[PDB]
C-alpha cells in the first residue's frame, strides 16, 4: 500500500499560500526515488537529514503541505526567513526536518488575460508561529480609527492576488511548492524500501 505522493504533486488544482493545504501520510511504503531521480524541480532543498538517504529511514508519519508562490518568494520557504510570505503566510520552524520542492508552472498557472486566483496575505499583526495557518479576511486596521468592516483610509483588505501572466519575468512567474515534513514520536509507520 504505497503512499499517494502523486495526489499532492500531480494534483490538478493547487491552493493559495495564505490557505496552504496540509495532507497527512500515515502507515505506507514511501518510494522517494520517484522524486529524486528527476530534474523537474527548480529548487529541491532538504534540511535536517540527507536528501537521498531518506529511503532507508522510517518515520512515524509524513506531512505534505502544498501551495503556489511567485518565483522570487520561493527563497522564503526555508527555516529562518523573514519576508512577507514567511512571516504572514507560511513559516517554517528553526528545527525543521524535511524538504521543500518547487517547480515552475507558468504554462498551467498563468493565462494571457491574467490569473488572479492565487493570493497571499499582506497585512497581519504579529507573525505566524511555525506551521500556523490564517484564512481570516477581516479588514486590517492600520491606524487608530476603527474600520467597522468597511475598507478605507488606514483600513486595508489583508489579501492581495498574484498577477500571473506568461510575459512576467522568472521572478514573478508562478511556482508550485510542496513541503514534506517528517514527524517523530515514541510511537511506531512510514518506512519505504
Amino acid at each position: 500500500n504505497l503512499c499517494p505522493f502523486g495526489e499532492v504533486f500531480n494534483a490538478t488544482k493547487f491552493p493559495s499560500v495564505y490557505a496552504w493545504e496540509r495532507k497527512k501520510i500515515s502507515n505506507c511504503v514511501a518510494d522517494y526515488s520517484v522524486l529524486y531521480n528527476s530534474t523537474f524541480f527548480s529548487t529541491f532543498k532538504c534540511y535536517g537529514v540527507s536528501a537521498t538517504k531518506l529511503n532507508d529511514l522510517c518515520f512515524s508519519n509524513v506531512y505534505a503541505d502544498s501551495f503556489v508562490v511567485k518565483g522570487d518568494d520561493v527563497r522564503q520557504i526555508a527555516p529562518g526567513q523573514t519576508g512577507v510570505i514567511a512571516d504572514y503566510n507560511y513559516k517554517l520552524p528553526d528545527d525543521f526536518m524535511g524538504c521543500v520542492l518547487a517547480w515552475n508552472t507558468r504554462n498551467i498557472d498563468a493565462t494571457s488575460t491574467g490569473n488572479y486566483n492565487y493570493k497571499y496575505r499582506l497585512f497581519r499583526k504579529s507573525n505566524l508561529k511555525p506551521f500556523e495557518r490564517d484564512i481570516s479576511t477581516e479588514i486590517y486596521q492600520a491606524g487608530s480609527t476603527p474600520c467597522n468592516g468597511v475598507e478605507g483610509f488606514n483600513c486595508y483588505f489583508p489579501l492581495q492576488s498574484y498577477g500571473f501572466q506568461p510575459t512576467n519575468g522568472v521572478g514573478y512567474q508562478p511556482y508550485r511548492v510542496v513541503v514534506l515534513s517528517f514527524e517523530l514520536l515514541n510511537a511506531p509507520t512510514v518506512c519505504g524500501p
Partner: protein, 596 residues
C-alpha cells in the same frame, strides 16, 4: 500606530496595487507601439486613464499623511513623490485645455509638411525628407529653403499654442509651490534632507554656468576650425569672423554637427572606421547585433538578457502589414518584464545604439528589487550616461577589432586618433552650447524675464552670443523657432543632455581607472573588466533610493558634476585645434548676418 508606520503600510499597499496596474498599462501601450491600430490605441488610452485615476486617488490619499512627522528618508521620498499634485491643481477646463494644446503641438510637429515651390507636388515632412536635406545637401539655397520652410510653417502654428502652454504650465508650477515651470523641471535635481549631499534648484543653474565657462575655449576652437572648413564649402557665404549660418550645421537645428564630418575631416587620406560593409558582408542581423551586445555586458560581470526579453522584444521592422513606432526605446514594464523596441538596421550606428539601449535595460534590471516608486535613475541624466559609456566602449577600435568587424592590420596613426576625436567632438561638444542655450532661453521665458514681444529677439541674441550661430533670414515674433524642436514642442526638459554628457565622461574615467586602463581615455574599452562592472553595478542597484550626488560619488568620488573628465578626453584634439587655428580667428562677432 505611528504616522511613519501608517505611511509604511500605505506604501506597501500602494506598491502591491500599483505593480499590476502599471504592468497592464505597459502591455497596452506596447501593443500600440508594436501594432498601430484603433483597437490598440483605445486599449492603451483606457489602461493609461485607469492608471492615472489610480495615481490621483493615491495622491489625494497620501496627502493625508503629514510629511513633517516622517523620520525615515526613504518613506519620506516615496510619500513626496506620491503627494505631487501635478496637473491636478488646475481647474477642470484649464486641465482639459492644457492636455488639448499639448496633443495639438505634438500633432503639428509630428505631421507638418512643407512643399517645394519649384515643384509643388513634392512635399516633405520633417522625417525623412527635410532631415535628409539638412544632412546631405551641399546647396546653400536648398538648405536655406528647408530650414526656413520648417520654421515659417510649423513654428508659426506652434507660437500661440506655446504662449498658452507657457501660461498654463506656469499656473500649474506656481500652484504646486514652485517659482515657475523651469523651477519645477530643475526640481528633478533637488536633494533636501541629507546633510552633506543637499542640492537646491538654483545650484543647478550655478553649476551649469560655471562648467560651461570652462567648456568655452574648446568649443571656441572647434567652432573656428569648422568655420574655416565650411568657408571652403560655401565660398562667399561665410565671414571668417562671424557666426555660423544656422542652416549649414548638419541637421535641422544644429543640435549635432555630426554630418559636417565629410566637410571637416582632418585627414581625409585615412580610411574611416565605418564597419557597416563588414557587417553586411558577414551576414549580420539584428539577432547577431543584440547577441554581441549581450556578450559585451556579460563579459563585465552583468547578467544575460532574460528569456522574456528574447521572446518579447521587437528588434526589426515588422513590414508593411504591421506598422509600428520605430524610435529606439528600452521598456521596463515591471514584473520582471524587460523589452527593447527598435527597428534595427545592419549599421554601425545601430550597433552602438543597441549597446546604449541594452545599457538602459541593464540599469532597469539592476534596480528591479527596489520598491516601485524608487525604480528610476538617480536623476534624468543617468540612463543616457550609462548607455553612452557602453557605446563609447563599443566604438573604440580595440573593441571593434576584437569583435572582428575591423581588420587587424588597421594602423592607428596619430592622425586616425585626431580623426576619431574630431568626429566624436562634432557630436558631443558641438551639442553642449546648443543644449545650454536652449534651456537658458526656456528658463528665462518661464521666469518671465523675456517678454512675448521679444521672444525670438532674445532667442537669436542668445544664439549668436552663446552658440556662435546666426540665422540666415530675420525672424519676427510670428516665428517660434525653439518650438520647431521635438523636445520643446513635446514638453521634455533638455538640460538632461548636458548633465548626462558630463556624467558619462566622469563615469568613463572612473570605470577605466577601475579597469586599469593606461593610454588616452578615448582609447579605453572596459570589456572583460569585472571590476568596472562591479563598480558600475554598485550605483545601478540604488535606483532613486539614494541622492544622485551620493550615487555619483559612489562611482566617481565626487558629489557634483565635473568637466575635467570631458576636457581630458578631448585634450589631444584641443591642442591640435589650437595649432590648426594659429592663423585663424577664434571667437565670433555677434553682429554679422548673412543678410543686410
Amino acid at each position: 500606530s505611528t504616522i511613519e508606520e501608517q505611511a509604511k503600510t500605505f506604501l506597501d499597499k500602494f506598491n502591491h496595487e500599483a505593480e499590476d496596474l502599471f504592468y497592464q498599462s505597459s502591455l497596452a501601450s506596447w501593443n500600440y507601439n508594436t501594432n498601430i491600430t484603433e483597437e490598440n490605441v483605445q486599449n492603451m488610452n483606457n489602461a493609461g486613464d485607469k492608471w492615472s485615476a489610480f495615481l490621483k486617488e493615491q495622491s489625494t490619499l497620501a496627502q493625508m499623511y503629514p510629511l513633517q512627522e516622517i523620520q525615515n528618508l526613504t518613506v519620506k521620498l516615496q510619500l513626496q513623490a506620491l503627494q505631487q499634485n501635478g496637473s491636478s491643481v488646475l481647474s477642470e477646463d484649464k486641465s482639459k485645455r492644457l492636455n488639448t494644446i499639448l496633443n495639438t503641438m505634438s500633432t503639428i510637429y509630428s505631421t507638418g509638411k512643407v512643399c517645394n515651390p519649384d515643384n509643388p507636388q513634392e512635399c516633405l515632412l520633417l522625417e525623412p525628407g527635410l532631415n535628409e536635406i539638412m544632412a546631405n545637401s551641399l546647396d546653400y539655397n536648398e538648405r536655406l529653403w528647408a530650414w526656413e520652410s520648417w520654421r515659417s510653417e510649423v513654428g508659426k502654428q506652434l507660437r500661440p499654442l506655446y504662449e498658452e502652454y507657457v501660461v498654463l504650465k506656469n499656473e500649474m508650477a506656481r500652484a504646486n509651490h514652485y517659482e515657475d515651470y523651469g523651477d519645477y523641471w530643475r526640481g528633478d535635481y533637488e536633494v533636501n534632507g541629507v546633510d552633506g549631499y543637499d542640492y537646491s534648484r538654483g545650484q543647478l543653474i550655478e553649476d551649469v554656468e560655471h562648467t560651461f565657462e570652462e567648456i568655452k575655449p574648446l568649443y571656441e576652437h572647434l567652432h573656428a576650425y569648422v568655420r574655416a572648413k565650411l568657408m571652403n564649402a560655401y565660398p562667399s557665404y561665410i565671414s571668417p569672423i562671424g557666426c555660423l549660418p544656422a542652416h549649414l550645421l548638419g541637421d535641422m537645428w544644429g543640435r549635432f554637427w555630426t554630418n559636417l564630418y565629410s566637410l571637416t575631416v582632418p585627414f581625409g587620406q585615412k580610411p574611416n572606421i565605418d564597419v557597416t560593409d563588414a557587417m553586411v558582408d558577414q551576414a549580420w542581423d539584428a539577432q547577431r547585433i543584440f547577441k554581441e551586445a549581450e556578450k559585451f555586458f556579460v563579459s563585465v560581470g552583468l547578467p544575460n538578457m532574460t528569456q522574456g526579453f528574447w521572446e518579447n522584444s521587437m528588434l526589426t521592422d515588422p513590414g508593411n502589414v504591421q506598422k509600428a513606432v520605430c524610435h529606439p526605446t528600452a521598456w521596463d514594464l515591471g514584473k520582471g518584464d524587460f523589452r527593447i523596441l527598435m527597428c534595427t538596421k545592419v549599421t554601425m550606428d545601430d550597433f552602438l545604439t543597441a549597446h546604449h539601449e541594452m545599457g538602459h535595460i541593464q540599469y532597469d534590471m539592476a534596480y528591479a528589487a527596489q520598491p516601485f516608486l524608487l525604480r528610476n535613475g538617480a536623476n534624468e541624466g543617468f540612463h543616457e550616461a550609462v548607455g553612452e559609456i557602453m557605446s563609447l566602449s563599443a566604438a573604440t577600435p580595440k573593441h571593434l577589432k576584437s569583435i572582428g568587424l575591423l581588420s587587424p592590420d588597421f594602423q592607428e596613426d596619430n592622425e586616425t586618433e585626431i580623426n576619431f576625436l574630431l568626429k566624436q567632438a562634432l557630436t558631443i561638444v558641438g551639442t553642449l552650447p546648443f543644449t545650454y542655450m536652449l534651456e537658458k532661453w526656456r528658463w528665462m521665458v518661464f521666469k518671465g524675464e523675456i517678454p512675448k514681444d521679444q521672444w525670438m529677439k532674445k532667442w537669436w541674441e542668445m544664439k549668436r552670443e552663446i552658440v556662435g550661430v546666426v540665422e540666415p533670414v530675420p525672424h519676427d515674433e510670428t516665428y517660434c523657432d525653439p518650438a520647431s524642436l521635438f523636445h520643446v514642442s513635446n514638453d521634455y526638459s533638455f538640460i538632461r543632455y548636458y548633465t548626462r554628457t558630463l556624467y558619462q565622461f566622469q563615469f568613463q574615467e572612473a570605470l577605466c581607472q577601475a579597469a586599469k586602463h593606461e593610454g588616452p581615455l578615448h582609447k579605453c574599452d572596459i570589456s572583460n573588466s569585472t571590476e568596472a562592472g562591479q563598480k558600475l553595478f554598485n550605483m545601478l542597484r540604488l535606483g532613486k533610493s539614494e541622492p544622485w550626488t551620493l550615487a555619483l560619488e559612489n562611482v566617481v568620488g565626487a558629489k557634483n558634476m565635473n568637466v575635467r573628465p570631458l576636457l581630458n578626453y578631448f585634450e589631444p584634439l584641443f591642442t591640435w585645434l589650437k595649432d590648426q587655428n594659429k592663423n585663424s580667428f577664434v571667437g565670433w562677432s555677434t553682429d554679422w548676418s548673412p543678410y543686410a
